[PDB]
Structure formats: C-alpha cells, structure tokens
Amino acid sequence: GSCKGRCFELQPDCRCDNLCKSYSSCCHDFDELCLKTARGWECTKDRCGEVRNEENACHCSEDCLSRGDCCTNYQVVCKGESHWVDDDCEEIKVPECPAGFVRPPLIIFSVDGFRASYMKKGSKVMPNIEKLRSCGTHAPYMRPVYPTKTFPNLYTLATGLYPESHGIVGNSMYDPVFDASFHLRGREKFNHRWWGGQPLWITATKQGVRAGTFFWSVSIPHERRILTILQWLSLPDNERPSVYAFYSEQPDFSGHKYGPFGPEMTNPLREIDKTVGQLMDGLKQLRLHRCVNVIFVGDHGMEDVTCDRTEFLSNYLTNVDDITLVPGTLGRIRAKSYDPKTIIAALTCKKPDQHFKPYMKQHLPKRLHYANNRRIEDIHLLVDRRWHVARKPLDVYKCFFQGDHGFDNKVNSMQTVFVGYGPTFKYRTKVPPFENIELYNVMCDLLGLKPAPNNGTHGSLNHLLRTNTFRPTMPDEVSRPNYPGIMYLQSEFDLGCTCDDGSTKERHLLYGRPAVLYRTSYDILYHTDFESGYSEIFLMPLWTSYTISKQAEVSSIPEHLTNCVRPDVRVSPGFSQNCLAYKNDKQMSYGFLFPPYLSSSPEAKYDAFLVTNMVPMYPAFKRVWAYFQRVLVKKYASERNGVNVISGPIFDYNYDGLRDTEDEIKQYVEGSSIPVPTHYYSIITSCLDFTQPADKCDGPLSVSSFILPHRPDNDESCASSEDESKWVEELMKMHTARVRDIEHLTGLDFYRKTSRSYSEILTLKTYLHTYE
Numbered sequence: 001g002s003c004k005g006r007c008f009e010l011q012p013d014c015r016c017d018n019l020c021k022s023y024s025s026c027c028h029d030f031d032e033l034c035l036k037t038a039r040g041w042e043c044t045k046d047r048c049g050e051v052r053n054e055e056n057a058c059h060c061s062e063d064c065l066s067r068g069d070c071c072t073n074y075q076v077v078c079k080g081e082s083h084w085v086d087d088d089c090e091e092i093k094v095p096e097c098p099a100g101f102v103r104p105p106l107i108i109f110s111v112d113g114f115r116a117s118y119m120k121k122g123s124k125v126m127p128n129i130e131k132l133r134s135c136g137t138h139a140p141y142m143r144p145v146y147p148t149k150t151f152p153n154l155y156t157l158a159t160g161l162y163p164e165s166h167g168i169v170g171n172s173m174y175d176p177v178f179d180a181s182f183h184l185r186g187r188e189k190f191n192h193r194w195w196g197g198q199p200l201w202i203t204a205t206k207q208g209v210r211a212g213t214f215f216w217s218v219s220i221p222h223e224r225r226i227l228t229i230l231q232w233l234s235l236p237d238n239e240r241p242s243v244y245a246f247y248s249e250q251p252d253f254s255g256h257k258y259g260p261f262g263p264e265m266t267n268p269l270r271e272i273d274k275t276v277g278q279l280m281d282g283l284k285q286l287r288l289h290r291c292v293n294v295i296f297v298g299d300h301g302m303e304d305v306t307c308d309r310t311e312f313l314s315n316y317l318t319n320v321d322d323i324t325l326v327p328g329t330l331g332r333i334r335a336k337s338y339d340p341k342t343i344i345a346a347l348t349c350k351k352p353d354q355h356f357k358p359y360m361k362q363h364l365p366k367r368l369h370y371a372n373n374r375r376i377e378d379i380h381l382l383v384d385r386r387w388h389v390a391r392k393p394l395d396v397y398k399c400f401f402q403g404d405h406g407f408d409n410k411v412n413s414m415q416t417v418f419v420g421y422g423p424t425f426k427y428r429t430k431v432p433p434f435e436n437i438e439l440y441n442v443m444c445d446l447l448g449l450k451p452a453p454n455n456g457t458h459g460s461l462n463h464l465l466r467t468n469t470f471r472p473t474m475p476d477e478v479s480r481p482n483y484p485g486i487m488y489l490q491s492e493f494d495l496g497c498t499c500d501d502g503s504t505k506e507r508h509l510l511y512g513r514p515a516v517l518y519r520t521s522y523d524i525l526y527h528t529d530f531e532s533g534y535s536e537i538f539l540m541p542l543w544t545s546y547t548i549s550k551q552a553e554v555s556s557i558p559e560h561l562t563n564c565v566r567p568d569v570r571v572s573p574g575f576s577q578n579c580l581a582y583k584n585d586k587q588m589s590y591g592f593l594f595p596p597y598l599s600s601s602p603e604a605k606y607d608a609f610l611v612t613n614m615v616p617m618y619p620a621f622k623r624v625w626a627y628f629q630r631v632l633v634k635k636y637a638s639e640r641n642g643v644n645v646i647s648g649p650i651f652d653y654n655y656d657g658l659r660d661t662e663d664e665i666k667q668y669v670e671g672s673s674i675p676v677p678t679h680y681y682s683i684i685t686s687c688l689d690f691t692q693p694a695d696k697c698d699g700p701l702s703v704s705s706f707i708l709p710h711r712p713d714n715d716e717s718c719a720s721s722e723d724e725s726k727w728v729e730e731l732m733k734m735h736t737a738r739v740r741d742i743e744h745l746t747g748l749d750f751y752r753k754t755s756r757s758y759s760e761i762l763t764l765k766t767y768l769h770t771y772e
C-alpha cells in the first residue's frame with residue numbers, strides 16, 4: 001500500500017510507476033514522496049553541502065552522488081564544473097561508459113510539433129540543441145508519416161511501420177470489428193487491442209534489453225522526468241534500462257495557440273532547450289555524456305491554421321446528418337447509422353477555390369500508404385495546407401487556435417527534426433532528409449537489436465552512424481529472363497491488329513537489368529531505342545527502359561501510323577495482347593511504354609508500335625500519359641542533361657502497396673486475359689552532377705519517380721478541361737514516389753549494377769522528390 005523506496009519503479013495493488021496517475025492507481029503516498037517539488041530543480045550556492053532533507057525535489061548534499069538524485073546543476077554550482085553546453089565539441093570515437101555497461105544507452109528525446117525550421121533560430125534561443133545538432137549528426141528535416149498527427153507518428157517512430165500497418169491511423173479512429181472508437185481523451189487508448197506491430201520497448205524486452213517507460217503522465221513535470229531518467233541510469237547493471245524516452249508536449253501546445261511563427265514561440269523553445277541542458281548536465285555529472293546516444297526527434301511540424309479557413313461539408317452535401325466526419329486537417333467520412341459515389345461526386349471540383357479534395361482511399365497518392373486498414377474510411381479528404389474541413393458552420397468555435405498539423409506529409413510546414421548525438425552517431429555530420437519510418441531500424445542498430453519486420457529500408461540510414469552492425473545485401477533474382485530471337489512469322493498472328501508498314505544495353509539500361517523478385521516468365525526484348533522486360537503472364541512489360549539525351553528530338557506519330565500495332569515476332573501469339581479486345585472494350589484504349597514521340601529515326605519508330613510495348617489505357621489517362629511522353633520526358637532530359645526512364649504497370653487492386661498476384665487482379669480488358677493496371681510508374685534517373693550526361697555519369701545519381709493512378713476520368717484534376725500544360729505536371733507531382741515504393745508494387749529491384757555502394761543506392765531508393 002505504499003510507494004516508500006519505489007518511486008518510478010520500472011515494474012489493483014497500488015502503483016508508483018510514472019503512469020499510475022493516468023490509470024488512477026497510485027498509492028496514497030505517491031504524490032507526497034514521488035512528486036516532491038520543494039526548492040525546485042536547481043542547486044544554488046547556499047545549498048552546497050546541505051544536510052539531506054527528504055522533502056527536497058533534488059539534492060545538493062555530499063551524499064547525493066552516492067544516491068543518484070543530485071540536481072542536474074550540482075557539480076556546476078557546488079564543484080566548479082562547466083555546463084555541458086559551454087564545453088567545445090570533442091569527437092566521441094568510442095563509447096566511454098562505466099564497466100558493466102554492455103551497450104551504450106539510448107535516450108530518445110521527442111518533441112511534439114517541433115517544426116524543422118525552428119532549428120534556424122540558433123544558439124541564442126537553443127544553445128544546448130544547437131550544440132547537439134552541430135557536434136552530432138543531423139538532417140535538415142525529417143519527414144513524418146500521414147496523417148501528420150501525434151499518435152500515428154510517435155507509434156511509427158516506435159515501430160518502423162506505416163500507420164496502416166501499425167493500426168494507429170489517427171488521433172481518432174473507429175474500428176468496425178471492435179465497434180468502438182479510439183480518442184486522445186478517454187480510456188479506450190489504453191486497451192492493447194488498438195496497437196499493432198512491435199514497438200521498440202517490446203523489441204528490446206523480447207531480446208533481453210530493458211526499457212524505461214516511453215510514456216509520461218502529463219502530471220509529471222519535465223524536470224522530474226529528466227531526474228527519473230538520470231536516476232534509472234544510476235541503477236545497478238541487472239536493473240538498469242538501456243533505452244529511455246522523454247516526451248515534451250511543447251512546442252506543439254504553443255504552436256497550436258499562437259501558430260508556428262509567433263514571437264511567443266521563443267519561450268517554449270527556450271524551455272525545451274533548458275530541459276535538454278538539464279539532461280546533458282545530468283549526464284555529464286554521471287560521466288555518461290560520452291556514453292549515451294541521444295536522439296532529438298519530433299513527430300511533425302506545425303502550420304498556420306485559423307478557424308476562419310474552414311470548408312463545410314454542409315455546402316456540398318445535401319444532408320450532413322447522414323454522415324460522420326472525422327474533421328480538421330484531414331477528412332474521413334462514413335455513414336452515420338448515404339451513398340459513397342454520390343458523396344464523392346458532390347465533393348468534387350464544386351468551388352473554384354475549393355481547399356480540399358475527396359478521394360476514395362485506394363486513389364490517394366500511393367506515397368501516403370494510407371488505405372490498407374479497416375480503420376481508414378473509404379472516403380477521404382485531403383485538406384489544403386492552412387485549412388480545415390468541418391461538417392457545418394456551427395462546428396467552428398471562436399479563433400482558439402492559430403496552428404495545426406495533420407496535412408499531407410510532403411508539406412514543408414509538416415517536416416520535423418532529427419539530431420543524433422553520441423558515440424555511435426557520426427561527428428559534425430549532415431545527412432540528407434529522410435522519413436521517420438526509417439528510425440526504428442536505426443534505434444535497433446544502436447541497441448544491438450534485431451528489428452521486427454517494418455517499412456524502413458534497413459541500411460538506407462547507415463550513413464548516420466560511425467559504426468554499423470547491419471550490412472544490407474542485394475536480394476537474389478528469383479526469375480531469370482529469356483532472350484527470345486525471331487521464331488514466329490507475321491502470318492501466324494491472329495491478334496486482330498493492323499499497321500500500315502546489341503549496344504541497346506549500353507545506351508538504354510544504365511543501371512543494369514531490374515531483378516524480378518517473384519516467380520514468373522518474362523522476356524528481355526531489345527530495340528534501337530529501348531529495352532523491356534516483357535511478362536508472358538501479364539502480357540505486357542514489367543518495365544521498359546530507355547535513355548533520352550539532352551539533344552533528343554521529339555517527333556509526331558505520323559497519320560499513317562495513328563492506329564498501328566504490329567505483332568512481335570519474338571513472342572508467341574498466345575502470350576501477346578490482341579487488338580480485338582481493345583476494339584470490343586468500349587471504355588479502354590491503349591498506349592505505349594516507350595513513346596513513339598522519342599524514336600531516334602522514322603525506321604526505329606516502328607518498334608514503338610510493337611504489341612509487346614502496348615499497355616491498356618483509359619482515354620482519360622491517355623491525356624496524361626501522352627503529355628508526359630510527348631512533352632515532359634523531353635523537358636526533363638533538357639533540364640537534367642539527359643535522363644534514363646524506366647516505366648511500367650502496377651497492379652494493386654487490394655491497395656496494400658504490394659504487387660498483386662494474378663488472383664488479385666479484378667479487371668481485365670473485356671473478353672480477354674489482359675489485366676488492367678491500377679497505376680503506371682516511371683523512374684527518371686540522371687547524374688547528380690548535371691555537368692555529366694546521364695549515360696556517362698561517374699558519381700551519385702539523381703532520381704525522381706511517380707506512380708500515376710490509372711483512372712477512367714480526370715476528376716482528380718479540377719483544371720483538366722484546360723490544356724495539359726496547366727494540370728498534368730501538377731497531377732504528377734502529387735503522385736511523386738520513392739523508387740522503393742515502386743519496388744514494393746512491382747516485385748522489381750532497381751539499380752543493381754552501378755558504381756555506387758549498396759547502402760548509397762538504398763538511400764537513393766528511399767529518396768522522395770517533394771516539389772516544395
């Protein structure tokens with residue numbers, strides 16, 4: 001019944017752990033013994049050498065070091081030591097830990113709503129943080145997951161999983177299997193049923209590594225959280241955790257009230273830095289300041305949003321009482337106790353300035369990875385940055401907030417911070433921006449743990465670390481290609497088609513053949529202008545590769561070839577598409593993967609009309625694809641000193657972000673076994689050093705990629721009635737993708753033969769071109 005000698009113990013009989021408040025199960029004496037605040041949190045000169053008083057918050061007695069409960073500034077005030085922040089960076093070449101430490105501890109210092117750009121304020125406001133950032137390893141920014149809300153991001157940090165995989169797809173969710181709702185406020189969130197994957201503290205415990213608590217009752221002051229962490233670190237080897245987390249509700253709280261750019265934001269940032277100072281001072285006191293790896297990380301940024309920039313569903317829908325809306329910086333809509341198609345139509349391009357866009361979740365940009373969970377409603381609203389969506393005018397209250405977050409994770413204002421400091425991180429090193437899904441693997445590496453399966457690309461962040469305990473290995477090809485020669489005659493083909501008619505590898509396949517990582521049968525097909533990997537199962541290329549020089553010439557499809565499709569004599573009639581299917585399918589047309597517009601000669605252009613280069617395309621989609629092919633590829637080649645393009649189909653009918661089996665394809669061209677892609681990708685590569693052409697590049701590569709939804713209309717693009725130069729590129733930028741996203745969706749593995757290290761290539765594959 002007592003907390004005596006058990007305050008913040010690590011293990012209905014009453015509790016003294018840091019969460020007992022939140023379960024209201026603290027012992028009677030918990031507040032009096034575990035939450036002392038007398039004399040506050042700093043030693044002063046007159047307190048030095050005091051007789052211990054057990055009522056003090058922390059201690060300045062001679063014995064306090066033997067007890068591990070000195071105030072964090074005790075050595076500075078009472079033994080003439082300097083503050084950690086006043087010492088120069090000294091490179092930490094190896095961990096300097098007490099004997100009997102078996103690995104360097106990790107302290108995750110997470111800051112709620114810490115926008116990346118707040119680092120620009122410097123050592124005047126945040127001297128401790130600025131030193132961590134200077135002396136350690138930092139990124140200019142770290143990309144959060146969608147939605148850019150607290151719980152989905154913190155749990156992503158902890159698990160390496162997209163929200164659709166870990167299950168915390170929002171701060172609020174409804175689970176139809178449970179018939180219950182999860183919210184920030186309430187007891188429901190404490191139920192383990194909501195939480196999937198395997199968070200870091202569990203991964204650690206399962207592998208015999210002790211974790212401190214990762215959650216702090218809001219009642220526990222920040223200074224006490226630091227002292228508790230420091231006290232735990234002074235535990236004997238058999239009890240001491242190896243991983244700890246601190247969380248700060250700032251600067252989020254202030255960011256919401258004043259917005260991200262308020263002068264009132266300086267004080268919260270000063271307070272966070274002061275807390276960082278206390279930890280680093282505390283660590284220095286314990287001589288652990290060259291032992292512990294410290295991660296300073298946020299969950300997401302903060303945007304200017306005021307209640308005056310709110311769209312109301314009641315101005316679109318004829319009855320908003322039939323719907324339940326999860327509102328704000330995103331929208332999720334389901335039936336109250338109603339028809340989806342009607343709802344989407346009523347929300348689509350109805351006002352010129354319309355500040356959100358409806359999507360069926362499967363049509364959301366694939367880069368969001370926000371579909372494959374029963375908690376994500378079919379109907380989704382992407383809200384423009386700076387705006388909210390709500391059900392009706394009465395739902396806005398007057399404004400109480402000037403900042404918010406939750407928007408699309410490529411939005412600048414949503415980006416957050418990463419700093420790594422300690423023996424295992426590099427010294428004075430800047431690394432490119434990366435996604436928070438990657439951190440779990442790193443944290444596992446830092447702790448000697450095997451990560452549970454997750455969505456990071458293990459190895460992609462090796463360049464953050466002085467020492468790597470993980471070397472990635474390139475996956476093995478599963479299917480070997482065939483290289484068919486000419487073995488069928490024109491007259492053997494009955495495809496209903498009609499037409500009025502080996503340095504390929506050096507030129508067109510710059511980074512090696514893509515490896516097929518699933519069992520299938522496919523053919524390598526060579527031509528003057530392009531190479532392709534043609535699937536006998538799907539009757540089309542898995543990929544088509546070609547290189548367009550800066551100086552390449554765009555030509556038209558001549559009239560006499562407008563409807564030309566030619567049989568490919570290297571491939572059987574039985575493993576080819578047929579033109580009758582397209583003639584019969586009233587809604588479906590076709591396009592070409594290698595564009596006829598970029599043929600090297602009139603003679604070569606005939607290759608582009610081979611049936612093995614043809615893919616099913618809605619006429620609506622052809623507007624987008626034809627523009628990309630006719631105008632944008634030349635534009636990119638001209639800007640980037642040539643480009644290599646790999647394009648192809650994706651099939652993801654079950655919207656899990658993973659390539660479909662034949663079994664999962666739900667749509668075929670009428671009367672045929674020609675599957676309809678859900679998306680078309682392209683990967684566009686050139687030299688990072690643009691003074692070198694794409695085909696003669698000695699160094700780092702530069703990539704941008706997209707996964708375009710293969711839609712029968714352009715309802716997504718409200719300006720699609722206009723010329724393609726007004727909207728298609730905007731469409732493409734929205735559906736920007738990582739190469740890795742394409743790899744998951746195709747079963748292909750790119751960049752197998754380059755002059756770059758595999759870890760560098762993994763970094764390249766995880767890059768997202770954001771266009772901000």
Ligand SMILES: *[C@@H]1O[C@H](CO)[C@@H](O[C@@H]2O[C@H](CO)[C@@H](O[C@@H]3O[C@H](CO)[C@@H](O)[C@H](O)[C@@H]3O)[C@H](O)[C@H]2NC(C)=O)[C@H](O)[C@H]1NC(C)=O
Nearest residue numbers: 161162164165166196197369452453454455656657658744
């Ligand atoms: C993000 O990472 C997660 C975790 O690795 C991936 O989810 C995992 O996906 C696999 C493959 O679908 C699931 O394994 C499979 O489970 C089924 C059904 O139980 C079984 O029939 C198969 O034999 C196979 O083992 C696995 O459950 C699942 N893990 C989760 C949800 O935690 C996910 O695919 C990744 N997402 C992307 C877009 O790459």
Ligand SMILES: O=C(OCc1cc(Cl)cc(Cl)c1)N1CCN(CC[C@@H](O)c2ccc3[nH]c(=O)oc3c2)CC1
Nearest residue numbers: 108110150154155157158184214215216245247252
């Ligand atoms: O200490 C914690 O975890 C630290 C941690 C670190 C790491 Cl790396 C991983 C993990 Cl898994 C957890 N806690 C997490 C939740 N937090 C209150 C949330 C709630 O008060 C809140 C906060 C901000 C909001 N913004 C908003 O719009 O609504 C909000 C609601 C306090 C307890």
Ligand SMILES: CC(C)CCC[C@@H](C)[C@H]1CC[C@H]2[C@@H]3[C@H](O)C=C4C[C@@H](O)CC[C@]4(C)[C@H]3CC[C@]12C
Nearest residue numbers: 022189190191192195198199202215216217218
């Ligand atoms: C003040 C409030 C915001 C605090 C709320 C914290 C709450 C969400 C935490 C408390 C306990 C946590 C669970 C616990 O660590 C065990 C597991 C096992 C793991 O495999 C899945 C996660 C889960 C259920 C934790 C989820 C987060 C919980 C409920």
Ligand SMILES: [Ca+2]
Nearest residue numbers: 652658659660
């Ligand atoms: Ca799939």
Ligand code: NA
Nearest residue numbers: 582585586588
């Ligand atoms: Na047709």
Ligand code: NA
Nearest residue numbers: 714715717720
């Ligand atoms: Na349109």
Ligand SMILES: [Zn+2]
Nearest residue numbers: 112113150299
């Ligand atoms: Zn947050």
Ligand SMILES: [Zn+2]
Nearest residue numbers: 113252256405
């Ligand atoms: Zn917030």
